Amino acid sequence: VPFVEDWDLVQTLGEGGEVQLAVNRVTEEAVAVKIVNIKKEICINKMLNHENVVKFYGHRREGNIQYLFLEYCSGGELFDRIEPDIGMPEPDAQRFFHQLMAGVVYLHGIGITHRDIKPENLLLDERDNLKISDFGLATVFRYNNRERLLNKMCGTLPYVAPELLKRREFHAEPVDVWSCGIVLTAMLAGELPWDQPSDSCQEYSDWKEKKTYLNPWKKIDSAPLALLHKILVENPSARITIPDIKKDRWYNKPLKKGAKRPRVTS
Numbered sequence: 001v002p003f004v005e006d007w008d009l010v011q012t013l014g015e016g017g018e019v020q021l022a023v024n025r026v027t028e029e030a031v032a033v034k035i036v037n038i039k040k041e042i043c044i045n046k047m048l049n050h051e052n053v054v055k056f057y058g059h060r061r062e063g064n065i066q067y068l069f070l071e072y073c074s075g076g077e078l079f080d081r082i083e084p085d086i087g088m089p090e091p092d093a094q095r096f097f098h099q100l101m102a103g104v105v106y107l108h109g110i111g112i113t114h115r116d117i118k119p120e121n122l123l124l125d126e127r128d129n130l131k132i133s134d135f136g137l138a139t140v141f142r143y144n145n146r147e148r149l150l151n152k153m154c155g156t157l158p159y160v161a162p163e164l165l166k167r168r169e170f171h172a173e174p175v176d177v178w179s180c181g182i183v184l185t186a187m188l189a190g191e192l193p194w195d196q197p198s199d200s201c202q203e204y205s206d207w208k209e210k211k212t213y214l215n216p217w218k219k220i221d222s223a224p225l226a227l228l229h230k231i232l233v234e235n236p237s238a239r240i241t242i243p244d245i246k247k248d249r250w251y252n253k254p255l256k257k258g259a260k261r262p263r264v265t266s
């Protein structure tokens, strides 16, 4: 079929190079094209195949420019579904948190840590299905069933675990668990609890002192707040693991109806 390899760049999606929406000349199929750790990003992306992870279609090199062909998520960023200082309805947040956990379980299972989980990197498709995006900061923490401890400073300060700022070495998995907890906090309260998880940060000190009568915690129901109490634990060895997050009472609380399905009466 001629012209099937031709794509038109029709809109800018993100900055960093840049990301553009590409539409196939023949089929009108929409894909995201990333124009540009790059050799590592392609390498990690080639290992990935999961319904809650942005799909990698392939790459091409035109001289100094690298082109990454990725799944286009028309719903945009989770960040834009969060109303400032409000959040979003608790059942939506629970459904997004379930899909985030499925994606993170998948990645950890193949020994990959994302290292920059935040609502800007959680994209939504046309059915509002969450997809983990951008593996530019991602790394392998388990190879030949041997765990490698990390020491590199990666991420975004409001979402980083406190061990990254306090310890030379740390386990990868509790770091991603912590950022998911900050994502859950943002979805339920529409605000970030602190600039960074350090003792110098009053907001962080208040949380360790259990002053939940203050914001953002006073906007959050006791059931998801009990889960946040288990995730946002300073000691990464005492922090809840994903298998135990899946056993949490709020995580398993019926809240949300399925997608509105067409129906008639009489």
Ligand SMILES: O=C1Nc2cc(Cl)ccc2Nc2ccccc21
Residues within 6 Å of the ligand: 013, 014, 019, 032, 071, 072, 073, 074, 075, 076, 077, 123
């Ligand atoms: O797939 C995307 N979908 C998007 C769609 C809209 Cl309408 C806005 C923003 C993104 N977010 C993205 C950011 C980087 C790379 C791709 C996207």
